[PDB]
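pls read this stuff:
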Amino acid sequence: GSGYTNYNNGSNYTQKKQTIGLPPQVNPQAVDHIIRSAPPRVTTAYIGNIPHFATEADLIPLFQNFGFILDFKHYPEKGCCFIKYDTHEQAAVCIVALANFPFQGRNLRTGWGKER
């Protein structure tokens, strides 16, 4: 009875942090520097350099791993992944978690959101 748990969003089911945590994927020290970029508000992530053949389905098993996906939105007609995580640092982790990661023979990209 799994149905649809991940890739969701709510109110009484957020903030799942904890002490002692420094995995190989992403680290804290390599995140605080990113958070400084944008203000403590913008959550929309950014992962440019995406191949036209980039199915969101294959993107789930990558972003959701970093933090929590509320309403991830793919942009095939542009070239960039927009993830409005629940927390600021959350999405920011995706910028220091991949940054030119091996997807399918192409060096992806990273960045922040909020155009205005």
In short: The domain at 29-97 is CATH 3.30.70.330 (Alpha-Beta Plaits). Residues 46 and 79 are 10 Å apart (CA to CA). Helices lie at 29-35, 56-66, 88-97. The longest helix spans residues 56-66.
